[PDB]
């Protein structure tokens, strides 16, 4: 929509120091260093390349818009998976145990045994710690 675009155009403007309608490796360098980040010229060219679809060596507003729109979908998606994880994790210690899973399953209408739930933890527990971490949760969804 019109309103959504004018929001991304402000962020775009922040990068485009010169107001010429593109973001350059050096301009992106200036912003990233405002945020306390290094970065090398090599790393900078890579960030540009990942967004510069026409391949003329800078980023234009349409490329910026297309990128930001996919990031916008990744952000929301990440924050929804994160919220579900926090609900399964009762003590908020960063790990979902068997008792926590069984307790949530029970509320979801599924009365499982500890054997059954220990099997579900084992199914997602890649690292074998005995409980489910965040990436495993994201991967298991
Ligand atoms: Ca993505
Ligand atoms: Pb604003
Ligand atoms: Pb510029
Ligand atoms: Pb072009
Ligand atoms: Pb273009
Ligand atoms: Pb371009
Ligand atoms: Pb926990
Ligand atoms: Pb158990
Ligand atoms: Pb694990």
Curated annotation (Swiss-Prot):
GO molecular function: adenylate cyclase activator activity; calcium channel inhibitor activity; calcium channel regulator activity; calcium ion binding; calcium-dependent protein binding; protein kinase binding; protein phosphatase activator activity; protein serine/threonine kinase activator activity
Keyword line: Acetylation, Calcium, Cell projection, Cilium, Cytoplasm, Cytoskeleton, Disease variant, Flagellum, Host-virus interaction, Isopeptide bond, Long QT syndrome, Metal-binding, Methylation, Phosphoprotein, Repeat, Ubl conjugation
Modified residues (N6-methyllysine): 111
Effect of mutating residue 85 to L: In LQT14; significantly decreased of KCNN2 calcium-activated potassium channel activity; not changed KCNN2 expression; not changed KCNN2 location at membrane; decreased thermal stability in presence of calcium ions; decreased interaction with RYR2
Residues found modified as Phosphoserine: 77, 97
Cross-link (Glycyl lysine isopeptide (Lys-Gly) (interchain with G-Cter in ubiquitin)) at residue(s): 17
GO cellular component, one term: plasma membrane
Region (Necessary and sufficient for interaction with PCP4): 72-141
UniProt: Ca(2+) 4 binding residues: 125, 127, 129, 131, 136
Control of this protein's activity: (Microbial infection) Inactivated by S.flexneri OspC1 and OspC3 proteins, which specifically bind the apo-form of calmodulin, thereby preventing calcium-binding and activity.
Entry-annotated residues carrying Phosphotyrosine: 95, 134
Classification via InterPro entries: CALM/Myosin/TropC-like, EF-hand-dom_pair, EF_Hand_1_Ca_BS, EF_hand_dom
Gene3D superfamilies for this protein: EF-hand
Phosphothreonine found at: 40, 106
Complexes and interactors: Homotetramer. Interacts with MYO1C, MYO5A and RRAD. Interacts with MYO10. Interacts with CEP97, CCP110, TTN/titin and SRY. Interacts with USP6; the interaction is calcium dependent. Interacts with CDK5RAP2. Interacts with SCN5A. Interacts with RYR1. Interacts with FCHO1. Interacts with MIP in a 1:2 stoichiometry; the interaction with the cytoplasmic domains from two MIP subunits promotes MIP water channel closure. Interacts with ORAI1; this may play a role in the regulation of ORAI1-mediated calcium transport. Interacts with IQCF1. Interacts with SYT7. (Microbial infection) Interacts with Rubella virus protease/methyltransferase p150.
Free-text comment on this protein's domains from its UniProt entry: The N-terminal and C-terminal lobes of CALM bind to the C-terminus of KCNQ1 in a clamp-like conformation. Binding of CALM C-terminus to KCNQ1 is calcium-independent but is essential for assembly of the structure. Binding of CALM N-terminus to KCNQ1 is calcium-dependent and regulates electrophysiological activity of the channel. The C-lobe interacts with KCNN4 channels in a calcium-independent manner, whereas the N-lobe interacts with the S4-S5 linker of KCNN4 in a calcium-dependent manner playing a role as calcium sensor and gating the channel.
Function: Calmodulin acts as part of a calcium signal transduction pathway by mediating the control of a large number of enzymes, ion channels, aquaporins and other proteins through calcium-binding. Calcium-binding is required for the activation of calmodulin. Among the enzymes to be stimulated by the calmodulin-calcium complex are a number of protein kinases, such as myosin light-chain kinases and calmodulin-dependent protein kinase type II (CaMK2), and phosphatases. (Microbial infection) Required for Legionella pneumophila SidJ glutamylase activity.
Record-given protein name: Calmodulin-1
The gene coding this protein: CALM1
């Amino acid at each position: 929509t019109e309103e959504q675009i004018a929001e991304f155009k402000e962020a775009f403007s922040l990068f485009d120091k010169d107001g010429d309608g593109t973001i350059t490796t050096k301009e992106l360098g200036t912003v990233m260093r405002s945020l306390g980040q290094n970065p090398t010229e090599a790393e900078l060219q890579d960030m540009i390349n990942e967004v510069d679809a026409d391949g003329n060596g800078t980023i234009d507003f349409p490329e910026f818009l297309t990128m930001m729109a996919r990031k916008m979908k990744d952000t929301d998606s990440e924050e929804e998976i994160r919220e579900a994880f926090r609900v399964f994790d009762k003590d908020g210690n960063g790990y979902i145990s068997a008792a926590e899973l069984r307790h949530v399953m029970t509320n979801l209408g599924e009365k499982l045994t500890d054997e059954e739930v220990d099997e579900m933890i084992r199914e997602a527990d890649i690292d074998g710690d005995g409980q489910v971490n965040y990436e495993e949760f994201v991967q298991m969804m």
